[PDB]
From Swiss-Prot:
<comment type="similarity">
    <text>Belongs to the type II topoisomerase GyrB family.</text>
</comment>
<feature type="binding site">
    <location>
        <position position="63"/>
    </location>
    <ligand>
        <name>Mg(2+) 2</name>
    </ligand>
</feature>
<comment type="function">
    <text>A type II topoisomerase that negatively supercoils closed circular double-stranded (ds) DNA in an ATP-dependent manner to maintain chromosomes in an underwound state, while in the absence of ATP it relaxes supercoiled dsDNA. Also catalyzes the interconversion of other topological isomers of dsDNA rings, including catenanes. Gyrase from M.tuberculosis has higher decatenation than supercoiling activity compared to E.coli; as M.tuberculosis only has 1 type II topoisomerase, gyrase has to fulfill the decatenation function of topoisomerase IV as well.</text>
</comment>
<feature type="binding site">
    <location>
        <position position="12"/>
    </location>
    <ligand>
        <name>Mg(2+) 1</name>
    </ligand>
</feature>
<comment type="subunit">
    <text>Heterotetramer, composed of two GyrA and two GyrB chains. In the heterotetramer, GyrA contains the active site tyrosine that forms a transient covalent intermediate with DNA, while GyrB binds cofactors and catalyzes ATP hydrolysis.</text>
</comment>
<feature type="binding site">
    <location>
        <position position="65"/>
    </location>
    <ligand>
        <name>Mg(2+) 2</name>
    </ligand>
</feature>
<protein>
    <recommendedName>
        <fullName>DNA gyrase subunit B</fullName>
    </recommendedName>
</protein>
<comment type="function">
    <text>Negative supercoiling favors strand separation, and DNA replication, transcription, recombination and repair, all of which involve strand separation. Type II topoisomerases break and join 2 DNA strands simultaneously in an ATP-dependent manner.</text>
</comment>
<feature type="domain" description="Toprim">
    <location>
        <begin position="6"/>
        <end position="98"/>
    </location>
</feature>
<feature type="binding site">
    <location>
        <position position="63"/>
    </location>
    <ligand>
        <name>Mg(2+) 1</name>
    </ligand>
</feature>
Length: 185
C-alpha cells in the first residue's frame, strides 16, 4: 500500500483506494473534491510537492454520457490548473468501462469494450460451441450503476484485464478548454 503500490480511483457518483465525485473557486470547497485533493497528499498550486504523492496511479472512471463527461472534465481541469505535474509525469488515467456483457449460456460471461470487440467475441464464442440467447444474451450497459459490483471490479479495476488510457498534457489542456467554454455558458 506504499505509494508505488497504490492507486486512487475517482468514480462517478496493489492497494486500490476509491473516492466518489458526484456530478472553480467553489469547486475547491466541495468536500468530495477536498477528500480527493487531500488523499493525493501533494498540496496545491505553490504548495504542490510531487514527493508527497500518495498514489502511483490516479484513475478517473465515469459514464460515457454528458453527465459522465462533465465530472471527468471538471476533474481534469483541477489537475491541469493546480497539480499539473501529476499529468505531465503520467500518473493520470481514464478507465474504459465495458460496453457490453455477453451472457454465454453455460460458461463465464465475457465483456466487450467496443462494438468491434463485441462482434469478435461473439463470433469466437459461437465457433467454439458456446450458446447465447439471441434476444437478451447481449447486454448493452447504460451506465456504471447498471453493473454488478463484482463485475465492475473485474472489468475496470482488475489490473490484468482493465482497459486504461493515459491522460496526456494535451488531453488535459483539451478538458480545460472545454471547461472554459461551458462555463462561459
Amino acid at each position: 500500500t506504499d505509494p508505488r503500490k497504490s492507486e486512487l480511483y475517482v468514480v462517478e457518483g496493489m492497494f486500490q483506494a476509491i473516492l466518489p465525485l458526484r456530478g472553480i473557486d467553489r469547486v475547491l470547497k466541495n468536500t468530495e473534491v477536498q477528500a480527493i485533493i487531500t488523499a493525493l497528499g501533494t498540496g496545491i498550486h505553490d504548495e504542490f510537492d510531487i514527493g508527497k504523492l500518495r498514489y502511483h496511479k490516479i484513475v478517473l472512471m465515469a459514464d460515457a454520457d454528458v453527465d459522465g463527461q462533465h465530472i471527468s472534465t471538471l476533474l481534469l481541469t483541477l489537475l491541469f490548473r493546480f497539480m499539473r505535474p501529476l499529468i505531465e509525469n503520467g500518473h493520470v488515467f481514464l478507465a474504459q468501462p465495458p460496453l457490453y456483457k455477453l451472457k454465454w449460456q453455460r460458461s463465464d460471461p465475457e465483456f466487450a469494450y467496443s462494438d468491434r470487440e463485441r462482434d469478435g467475441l461473439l463470433e469466437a464464442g459461437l465457433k467454439a460451441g458456446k450458446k447465447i440467447n439471441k434476444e437478451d444474451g447481449i447486454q448493452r450497459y447504460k451506465g456504471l450503476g447498471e453493473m454488478d459490483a463484482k463485475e465492475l471490479w473485474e472489468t475496470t479495476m482488475d489490473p490484468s484485464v482493465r482497459v486504461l488510457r493515459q491522460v496526456t498534457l494535451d488531453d488535459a489542456a483539451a478538458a480545460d478548454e472545454l471547461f472554459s467554454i461551458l462555463m462561459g455558458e
